């Protein structure tokens, strides 16, 4: 779970 700017998301 990572929707937060800047978006650091492996998925």
């Amino acid at each position: 779970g990572f929707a937060s700017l800047p978006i650091l998301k492996n998925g």
Side-chain angles (χ1 to χ4, degrees), residues 1 4 11:
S4 292

Side-chain angles (χ1 to χ4, degrees):
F2 211 105
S4 292
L5 277 161
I7 295 170
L8 292 143
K9 179 64 180 180
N10 195 77

